[PDB]
């Protein structure tokens, strides 16, 4: 659950990945963040952030380890911005 700031039109270099679902583990998670000036300026995002959902959307059942095929269709065209994640035990000392 993260609300980016301006993205549409602009360029973005993100990626997703999977592993397997069974128990607290499987939900596709951002492969990595270019750490450029976009998501980088945001902070120190993580790959296990669990970015497989956007806006009020939740491609949970999806987790096709390629949700990008669609996610990329968002910022690209139709689809409101508002990336979302199902949380993920990550080291975030109230940065």
UniProtKB/Swiss-Prot annotation:
Disruption phenotype: Mice display abnormalities in social behavior and sensorimotor gating.
UniProt tissue specificity: High levels are seen in the brain, testis and kidney, lower levels in the ovary, breast, muscle, liver and small intestine, and very low levels are seen in the spleen and thymus. A moderate level expression is seen in the heart.
Processing after translation: Ubiquitinated; undergoes both 'Lys-48'-linked ubiquitination, leading to its subsequent degradation by the ubiquitin-proteasome pathway, and 'Lys-63'-linked ubiquitination. The interaction with INVS is required for ubiquitination. Deubiquitinated by CYLD, which acts on 'Lys-63'-linked ubiquitin chains.
Location relative to the cell: Cell membrane; Cytoplasm, Cytosol; Cytoplasmic vesicle
Residues annotated as transmembrane: none
Subunit structure: Interacts with CXXC4. Interacts (via PDZ domain) with TMEM88. Interacts with BRD7 and INVS. Interacts (via PDZ domain) with VANGL1 and VANGL2 (via C-terminus). Interacts (via PDZ domain) with NXN. Interacts with ARRB1; the interaction is enhanced by phosphorylation of DVL1. Interacts with CYLD. Interacts (via PDZ domain) with RYK. Self-associates (via DIX domain) and forms higher homooligomers. Interacts (via PDZ domain) with DACT1 and FZD7, where DACT1 and FZD7 compete for the same binding site.
Function (record text): Participates in Wnt signaling by binding to the cytoplasmic C-terminus of frizzled family members and transducing the Wnt signal to down-stream effectors. Plays a role both in canonical and non-canonical Wnt signaling. Plays a role in the signal transduction pathways mediated by multiple Wnt genes. Required for LEF1 activation upon WNT1 and WNT3A signaling. DVL1 and PAK1 form a ternary complex with MUSK which is important for MUSK-dependent regulation of AChR clustering during the formation of the neuromuscular junction (NMJ).
Protein name: Segment polarity protein dishevelled homolog DVL-1
Organism this protein belongs to: Mus musculus (Mouse)
């Amino acid at each position: 659950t993260v609300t980016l700031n301006m993205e549409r039109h602009h360029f973005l270099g993100i990626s997703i990945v999977g592993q397997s679902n069974d128990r607290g583990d499987g939900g596709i998670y951002i492969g990595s963040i270019m750490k450029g000036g976009a998501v980088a300026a945001d902070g120190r995002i993580e790959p296990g952030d669990m970015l497989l959902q956007v806006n009020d959307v939740n491609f949970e059942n999806m987790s096709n380890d390629d949700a990008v095929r669609v996610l990329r269709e968002i910022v690209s065209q139709t689809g409101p911005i508002s990336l979302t994640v199902a949380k993920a035990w990550d080291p975030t000392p109230r940065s």
